[PDB]
């Protein structure tokens, strides 16, 4: 629980406030970049390295038989555990296009090989969605669950632009909470199913969810319709029966008022929720620790690593999970004139 100011040696204008961090098979891969893929790296995905505070960003590449992806803005992420038939998978859907727009498409990502010089080759595959597909949305959450004993995907949350009939020029950029009906997805086949929940009467965004032993727990839960940040955690439990995937839900009395959190898994289930915003302008300073058992969530705090007055006074911030007690956060920087490297970086560590 201590921070360290970094400096990106170069390439300090390709990161945008919304983006994703995926640690898979060693190195960390950043997804989502300001502007369309520059011809430096038509991949649109960067390898990251942290050497003596220096932030180094390398170019990556996919296969020939791989699909090429638009750099989604703030998609949903799922770390599908390494198993048959294809270990290990990263399921993404569906973010916002840098050409400002949504894609209800769903991508599956894996690693291919190495090096031959420690270089990393990747592979992307779209999936047609037999559904009952959820329309395009963003800020939602996708998760993986393993129920008796097969693997399925749970999709819930997020908002979207106006319904297409109500798409109004002067209400175009506005966005309303997508209706609260969860979606169950088999990775194969891409048969998507919709399901209703009589207790989840409202959509929500940016609520970091967690999955464990085919049981899902939603923390956070900021909502537009009521301007509320209901701390109350939401648990649900699914049993994958053929062909009725039975589903149940339940309210928890207490969770936490977190919005767009950064989740670092340190142990197999020792998680720390790092930061976000506790109120509409009041960012969350403190850290929080959650132990995740079949008993459930178990809550505690840690010491908040002292934020230098720069970040502690900065209006907004964000970051991602470098993983394993380590995470990255960024600060919108000022200047006269702008450097224009307007983002400082704090590498934060647990223990």
């Amino acid at each position: 629980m201590s921070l360290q100011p970094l400096t990106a040696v170069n390439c300090g204008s390709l990161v945008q406030p919304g983006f994703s961090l995926l640690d898979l098979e060693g190195d960390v891969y950043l997804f989502g970049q300001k502007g369309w893929p520059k011809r430096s790296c038509p991949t649109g995905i960067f390898g990251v390295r942290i050497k003596k505070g220096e932030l180094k960003l390398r170019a990556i590449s996919f296969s020939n038989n791989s699909s090429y992806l638009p750099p989604l803005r703030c998609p949903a992420i799922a770390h599908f555990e390494a198993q048959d038939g294809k270990p290990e998978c990263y399921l993404i859907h569906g973010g916002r296009t840098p050409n400002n727009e949504l894609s209800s498409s769903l991508y599956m990502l894996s690693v291919d090989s190495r090096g031959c010089n420690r270089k990393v080759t990747l592979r992307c595959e779209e999936k047609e969605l037999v559904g009952d597909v959820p329309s395009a949305r963003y800020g939602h959450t996708l998760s993986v669950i393993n129920s008796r004993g097969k693997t399925a995907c749970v999709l819930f949350g997020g908002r979207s632009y106006m319904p297409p009939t109500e798409r109004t020029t002067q209400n175009w950029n506005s966005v309303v909470d997508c209706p609260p009906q969860v979606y169950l997805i088999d990775l194969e086949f891409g048969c998507c199913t919709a399901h209703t929940l009589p207790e989840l009467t409202d959509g929500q965004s940016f609520h970091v969810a967690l999955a464990r032993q085919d049981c899902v727990y939603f923390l956070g839960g900021h909502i537009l319709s009521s301007d509320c940040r209901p701390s109350r955690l939401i648990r649900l439990h699914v049993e994958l029966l053929l062909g009725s995937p039975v589903l149940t839900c339940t309210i928890l009395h207490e969770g936490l008022t977190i919005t767009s959190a950064i989740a670092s898994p340190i142990g197999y289930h020792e998680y720390i929720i790092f930061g976000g915003y506790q109120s509409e302008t009041q960012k969350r300073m403190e850290c929080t620790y959650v132990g995740l058992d079949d008993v459930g969530v178990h809550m505690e705090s840690r010491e908040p690593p002292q934020w230098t007055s720069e970040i502690s006074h900065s209006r907004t911030w964000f970051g991602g999970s470098l993983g394993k007690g380590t995470a990255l956060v960024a600060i919108p920087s000022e200047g006269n004139p702008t450097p224009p490297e307007a983002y400082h970086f704090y590498q934060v560590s647990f223990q």
Binding site: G18, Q170, W172, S174, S260
Partner: protein
């Protein structure tokens, strides 16, 4: 056509009206609504068929371009 200010125009007008006036230029207030013919949002019209995805009010003038961007600092600012 010559980039004058309000106070500019009022001084000029008041002056030229004092001497040999017989007011000539027009006061400010009258222009302040006389221009409304030349701005947008004055003239009746419609479309057949009606336009898709456009609120069909024909009188709105200057509009902020954000289009009701939800100010939520949670999301993209």
């Amino acid at each position: 056509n010559t980039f004058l200010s309000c106070s500019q125009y009022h001084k000029m007008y008041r002056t030229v009206k004092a001497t040999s006036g017989r007011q000539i230029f027009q006061p400010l207030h009258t222009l302040r609504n006389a221009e409304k013919e030349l701005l947008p949002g004055f003239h009746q019209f419609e479309w057949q068929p009606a336009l898709k995805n456009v609120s069909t009010s024909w009188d709105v003038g200057i509009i902020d371009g954000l289009s009701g961007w939800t100010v939520s600092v949670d999301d993209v600012p």
